[PDB]
């Protein structure tokens, strides 16, 4: 109850923070998916500008 | 009381600036109606 | 509150008939039920062994988890909704990607 | 014995909740779309019917296992039983 | 061993300040001493 | 109930004698809601949006600049505003750029009242973006 | 010594149940300053008071069982 | 003299069985998928993170955002290990005061050594609040430093003391039902008090906001 | 001898809750005058009523934690 | 007699939280009304209540630490 | 019996720090309601809370130092 | 036995300074929302602040002189 002596649990808590940093590290953010559509637009526009400079 | 108070301003001088910013955030279509009101035409004549 | 005490008492007249119609479903199992009476003994023998204690708060932490099964039939839409919302973005993206590539050629 | 307990959870996941995607598992993913929840259903009475996309019988079996596993440790302390059986 | 290189880029980033359990070890190890001492004097 | 809501620009008129049960106005010294029998006051406005809730299913999202709200003794209000535009006439893209340029001149203001003029300008563009 | 010990643990517990009277002074009292700004009366305004009135009394009738828990 | 309550005298036991199984067990409640579309039970776990990762991100807005990918692991562990224990005969590791003194101090002292490796002067020159008046310099810097070292004790003891306080009213209001072989009308009202109190004891999720957040404020203020 | 000291140390421990019997009386009386000004209750104004309630009952009930330990 | 006076010794010092037990009700009843008037909570107007809560719940468990150090 | 009064005397003497509990719950909540109406915090608004915090704190730790000096 | 009654009442008197700790909080709290509207600070705001501070002290300090009178 008023328990005692403490040599227990606290060494078994930091092994747990090797688990939770393994699972939650492999998550996906919805926002990152909206960023890859932006750089694809500017690249072909500059490639068309490279084709416009191939005209001009 | 605010920062425009206690520094020597008037509420018209407040209302001129905050309404001018709305006429700058408008598009190209509704810019003529910001040119329409645009009430800077009255001249100032004081005898001294 | 005069109207609210009858509102549970009208539910008391409602739950006694809904328990009666549920008692009619067991009357349809007067002959054909061979499932529960195989396993109703182990919960009658172990309850004759040890299982009584200060754990009437065992049911109330299992009773509240029944009320959330009600809203879980709406959690299928939110869960379902998340999948559909997720699905629309890729569809928009492929179409968007496709038009740009073809017209640049 | 490590490949023995690891092949217990990978059997009690991919059957009764929830059999994921990543093709080489694509039709294995829709195998959970019908689900074995119809197989998991018949234990309670009928009432936990909401298991369609928030699956109760997938989750509520582990938590029913973790209760009766912790009933064993408490049994020594709260004995209380006479020289008989209960009602 | 692969419970390391998944999170090894994370460790030497923040364990420079986060892995200071020595103060926990010293405040733990001293907390061991008073309880063995009170049972010694009973 | 038994209210009167009037909403007029200098050049145009939105509402005349047609009240709908709830008006949300951004006051200079806070904010309020009109409960159609509100205790009457004489307040003046800050830059912020007015969302009049029509009966009519839905709301009406206007955006005033500087005006005057006079709720009076009988249940009737008179909200008059100078630049009362809707949302779709504004562009968000020009409103993002106008903020930090007025913050750049804020340190570069030598006088005490000219700097106070700059503090007026950054407040109006701050309510511009967050309303969008 | 038995009836001596019981009663002065019981009276000194009932002090805490008028410790929640000073809250419903604010709950029932701050309805006044809200009602005068806006008369939307039979809305959630009076009903938010009942969420105040019976939750603050729920700390009032909290300790009163604990006093009778040490009566016996 | 109508309704006589009863009581039962019995020791309330926070024993210590084999813990290193019980700690690992709320890790395997959360799976992680290697797929694009997931399977509608991780997908409402994956959404629940992308809410409260957007509230411990917004305040900081620095290059101290690297720290914040850990702080959402800290919320899921004591978010789970406080919610598992509401079951009939389960055991919570955050009941014992031992590990919480190992959750505060390796995290709290990871904050004061964060600015002391980069700023080295103005981190604890935050002890200087304002444009210094004369009569209260010694009355200030003996106060604002005694309310600094309280913070590790202030962070751990607020968690252990109310979590276990939930468990005793679960027993004592619950145990008074069992020993109520007197008049049977009042048995239901004590039972109805329980099933309200178990709803209040899902503020064991609400008490993890008040552990990660006052760790952010104790990080944002120093850095 | 300490049988009474079991009681009054528990009998005095209970009146430390008498703060939070009034402290939630503030936060519910102070919500209706935050609501009658601005009827947007479904927003974060009601969400600050419960977190203010829960953080006050967190300092409410654990004063009764020291009450039972002196008893049991 | 050393044990018995300790039993009432920690009973009087339990109620030191009763100041923080309702002082946390006021400051979380004053951001219900400061967010109602001006919705700008995401700046200083929320971090001035948690900083209000840290420097006021520093004094709730401050006194129960003394009621422990008088007990054991 | 002489040490028996040494323990129960500091039992009620640390109740005087609870007065700096509820008295600090206002002056940190009044910098909420009076900040939104006038954003000038880096001027003497925050500085009159730190004076309001510290000199309200000085009557908190003074009634702590009685409990040390009564015991030793 | 003479030291038994002396050492309790010295702690029993210094709970009287807790109420001064409450009333001193509003005086630096209402001046926050008093000055926030009206920046005329160097005039009789602060002069009414210092008088309000040193008058609540004299209902807290006056018990403290009586508190040391019990010991001697």
Give me the count of residues in chain B.
48
Give me the count of residues in chain A.
56
Shortest CA gap A47–chain C (Å) = 9
- Asked if residue F76 and residue F118 are part of one domain, the reply reads no
- CB < 8 Å to K38, chain B: 1-2
Could you give the C-alpha distances from C27 to C19, C20, C21, C23, in angstroms and in order?
Answer: 12, 10, 10, 6
**Contacts with K41 (C-beta within 8 Å, 6 or more apart), sequence order:** J44, K35
Give me the count of residues in chain H.
223
Q: Phi, psi (5° rounding) for residue F25?
A: -125, 135
**Dihedral of alpha carbons G50, G55, G56, G61, sign:** positive
**Contacts with I32 (C-beta within 8 Å, 6 or more apart), sequence order:** G30, G31, G34, G45, G48, G49, G52
Measured between CB atoms, does C27 come within 8 Å of chain A? no
Cβ distance H136 to K54 less than 8 Å, yes or no, reads yes
Q: Which resolution in angstroms does this entry have?
A: 6.2
**Residue H1: how many CB atoms within 10 A of its CB?**
3
Please report how many Cα atoms fall inside a 13 Å half-sphere around the Cα of residue L72, on the Cβ side: 3
Give burial (CB, 10 Å; 0-12/13-18/19+) of H180: middle
Asked whether the bond before D18 is cis by omega within 30 degrees of 0, the reply is yes
User: Checking phi first, is residue F36 left (phi over 0); if not, alpha (psi -120 to 50) or beta?
Assistant: left
Distance between CA atoms of residues B39 and B32, nearest Å: 13
Measured between CB atoms, does L38 come within 8 Å of chain B? yes
Could you give the C-alpha distances from K58 to F95, K19, L56, in angstroms and in order?
Answer: 49, 11, 14
Q: Tell me the sheet residues that pair with F53.
A: F59
Query: Which regions of L1-72 does DSSP assign to beta strands (E)?
Result: none
How many domains is chain B partitioned into structurally?
Answer: 1
Could you give the C-alpha distances from L31 to L28, L47, L49, L53, in angstroms and in order?
Answer: 5, 11, 7, 11
Cβ distance H42 to D18 less than 8 Å, yes or no, reads yes
**Residues K23, K27, K33, CA angle at the centre, nearest 5°?**
140
How many domains is chain E partitioned into structurally?
Answer: 1
String of DSSP letters for H137-197: STTTTTTTTTTTTHHHHHHHHHHHHHHHHHHHHHHHHHHHHHT--S-TTHHHHHHHHHHHH
Distance between CA atoms of residues I56 and G31, nearest Å: 21
Measured between CB atoms, does F30 come within 8 Å of chain K? yes
Q: Tell me the sheet residues that pair with F26.
A: F31
Cβ distance H207 to I58 less than 8 Å, yes or no, reads yes
String of DSSP letters for C7-62: HHHHHHHHHHHHHHHHHHHHHTTTTT--SHHHHTTHHHHGGGTT--SS-SHHHHHH
Secondary structure of chain J as H, E, C letters: CHHHHHHHHHHHHHHHHHHHHHHHHHHCCCCCCHHHHCCCHHHHHHHHHHHHHHCCCCCCHHHHHHHHHCCC
Distance between CA atoms of residues I39 and A20, nearest Å: 42
- Asked if residue F6 and residue F42 are part of one domain, the reply reads yes
**Dihedral of alpha carbons C80, C81, C86, C90, sign:** positive
Cβ distance I61 to H172 less than 8 Å, yes or no, reads no
CATH number of the I1-72 domain: 1.20.20.10
Secondary structure of B14-42 as H, E, C letters: HHHHHHHCCCCCECCHHHHHHHHHCCCCC
Cβ distance I37 to F22 less than 8 Å, yes or no, reads no
Question: What stretches of chain H show up as alpha helix (H) in DSSP?
Answer: 19-22, 43-52, 68-71, 73-80, 97-100, 105-115, 150-178, 186-200, 206-220
- Asked if residue F38 and residue F99 are part of one domain, the reply reads no
**Residues B29, F59, F4, CA angle at the centre, nearest 5°?**
100
Q: Phi, psi (5° rounding) for residue I36?
A: -70, -25
Q: Phi, psi (5° rounding) for residue B46?
A: -110, 140
Range of F123's domain?
91-132
**Which of D18, D25, D66 lies at the smallest CB-CB distance from H40?**
D18
**Contacts with L54 (C-beta within 8 Å, 6 or more apart), sequence order:** none
**Contacts with F92 (C-beta within 8 Å, 6 or more apart), sequence order:** F129, F132
User: C-alpha K35: how far from its chain's center?
Assistant: 22
Structure tokens at K64: 């702590």
Of the candidates H139, L69, L11, H138, the residue with the CA atom closest to the CA atom of residue K63 = L11
Rounded-to-10 torsion of CA H184, G69, H201, H77 = -130
**Residue D78: how many CB atoms within 10 A of its CB?**
15
What is the SS3 assignment for D33?
A: helix
Find the residue in J nearest to I22 (Cα).
Answer: J22
Q: Phi, psi (5° rounding) for residue G35?
A: -70, -25
**Contacts with J13 (C-beta within 8 Å, 6 or more apart), sequence order:** J63, J64, J66, J67, J70, K10, K11, K12, K14, K15
- Indicate the domain borders of chain J: 1-72
Shortest CA gap F81–chain G (Å) = 23
Q: What CATH number does the domain containing B43 carry?
A: 1.10.1620.20
How many domains is chain F partitioned into structurally?
Answer: 2
Task: Using the CB atoms, write b or e for A26-46: b if 16+ within 10 Å.
Answer: ebeeeeeeeeeeeeeeeeeee
- CB < 8 Å to H34, chain A: 26
What is the SS3 assignment for F52?
A: strand
Distance between CA atoms of residues J2 and K7, nearest Å: 9
Distance between CA atoms of residues G12 and G71, nearest Å: 12
The β-bridge relationship of strands F48-53 and F67-71 is unpaired
């Amino acid at each position: 109850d008023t328990s005692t002596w403490f040599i227990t649990i606290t060494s078994m808590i930091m092994t747990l923070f090797i688990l939770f940093q393994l699972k939650i590290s492999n998550y996906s953010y919805p926002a990152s998916p909206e960023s890859i559509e932006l750089k694809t637009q500017k690249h072909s526009t500059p490639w068309e500008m490279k084709w416009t400079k191939i005209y001009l | 009381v605010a920062y425009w108070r206690q520094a020597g301003l008037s509420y018209i001088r407040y209302s001129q600036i905050c309404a001018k910013a709305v006429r700058d955030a408008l598009k190209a279509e509704f810019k003529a109606n910001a040119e329409k009101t645009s009430g800077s035409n009255v001249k100032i004549v004081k005898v001294k | 509150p005069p109207l609210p005490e009858h509102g549970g008492k009208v539910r008391l007249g409602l739950i006694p008939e809904e328990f009666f119609q549920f008692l009619y479903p067991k009357t349809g199992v007067t002959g054909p039920y061979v499932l529960g009476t195989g396993l109703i003994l182990y919960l009658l023998s172990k309850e004759i062994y040890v299982i009584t204690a200060e754990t009437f708060s065992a049911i109330s932490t299992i009773g509240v988890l029944v009320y959330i099964v009600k809203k879980y039939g709406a959690s299928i839409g939110a869960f379902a909704d998340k999948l559909n919302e997720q699905k629309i973005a890729q569809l928009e993206e492929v179409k968007q990607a496709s038009i740009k590539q073809i017209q640049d050629a | 014995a490590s490949v023995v307990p690891l092949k217990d959870r990978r059997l009690l996941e991919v059957k009764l909740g929830e059999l994921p995607s990543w093709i080489l598992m694509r039709d294995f993913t829709p195998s959970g779309i019908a689900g074995a929840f119809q197989r998991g259903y018949y234990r309670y009475y009928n009432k936990y019917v909401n298991v369609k996309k928030g699956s109760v019988a997938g989750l509520s079996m582990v938590l029913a296992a973790y209760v009766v596993f912790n009933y064993c440790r408490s049994y020594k302390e709260l004995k209380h039983e006479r020289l008989r059986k209960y009602h | 061993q692969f419970q390391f290189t998944g999170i090894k880029k994370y460790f030497n980033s923040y364990t420079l300040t986060g892995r200071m359990n020595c103060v926990l070890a010293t405040y733990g190890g001293i907390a061991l001493l008073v309880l063995y001492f009170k049972l010694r004097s009973k | 109930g038994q209210m009167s809501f009037t909403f007029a620009s200098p050049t145009q008129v939105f509402f005349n004698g047609a009240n709908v049960r709830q008006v949300d106005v951004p006051t200079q010294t806070g904010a309020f809601g009109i409960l159609a029998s509100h205790v009457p006051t004489l307040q003046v406005l800050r830059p912020g949006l007015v969302v009049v809730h029509a009966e009519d299913g839905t709301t009406s999202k206007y955006f005033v600049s500087s005006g005057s709200v006079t709720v009076n003794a009988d249940s009737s209000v008179q909200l008059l505003a100078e630049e009362a535009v809707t949302l779709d006439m504004l562009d968000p893209g020009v409103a993002k750029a106008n903020l930090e340029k007025a913050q750049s001149e804020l340190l570069g203001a030598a006088d005490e009242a000219s700097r106070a003029e700059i503090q007026i300008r950054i407040e109006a563009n701050e309510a511009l973006v967050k309303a969008l | 010594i038995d009836t001596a010990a019981k009663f002065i643990g019981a009276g000194a517990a009932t002090v805490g149940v008028a410790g929640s009277g000073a809250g419903i002074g604010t709950v029932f009292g701050s309805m006044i300053i809200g009602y005068a700004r806006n008369p939307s009366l039979k809305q959630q305004l009076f009903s938010y008071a009942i969420l105040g009135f019976a939750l603050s009394e729920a700390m009032g009738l909290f300790c009163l069982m604990v006093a009778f828990l040490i009566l016996f | 003299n109508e309704n006589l309550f009863a009581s039962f005298i019995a020791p309330t036991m926070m024993g210590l069985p084999i813990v290193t199984l019980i700690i690992m067990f709320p890790s395997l409640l959360f799976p992680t998928p290697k797929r694009l579309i997931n399977n509608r039970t991780i997908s409402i776990q994956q959404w629940l993170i992308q809410l409260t990762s957007k509230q411990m991100m917004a305040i900081h807005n620095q290059k101290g955002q690297t720290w914040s990918l850990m702080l959402m692991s800290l919320i899921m562990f004591i978010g789970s290990t406080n919610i598992l224990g509401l079951l009939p005969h389960s055991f919570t590791p955050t009941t014992q005061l031992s590990m919480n003194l190992g959750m505060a101090i390796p995290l709290w002292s990871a904050t004061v050594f964060t600015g002391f490796r980069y700023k080295t002067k103005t981190s604890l020159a935050h002890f200087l609040p304002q444009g210094t008046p004369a009569l209260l310099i010694p009355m200030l810097v003996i106060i604002e430093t005694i309310s600094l070292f309280i913070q590790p004790v202030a962070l751990a003891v607020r968690l252990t003391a109310n979590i276990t306080a939930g468990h005793l009213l679960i027993h004592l209001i619950g145990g008074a039902t069992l020993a109520l072989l007197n008049i049977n009308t009042m048995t239901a009202f004590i039972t109805f008090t329980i099933l309200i109190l178990l709803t209040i004891l899902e503020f064991a999720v609400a008490l993890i906001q008040a552990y990660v957040f006052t760790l952010l404020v104790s990080l944002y203020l120093h850095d």
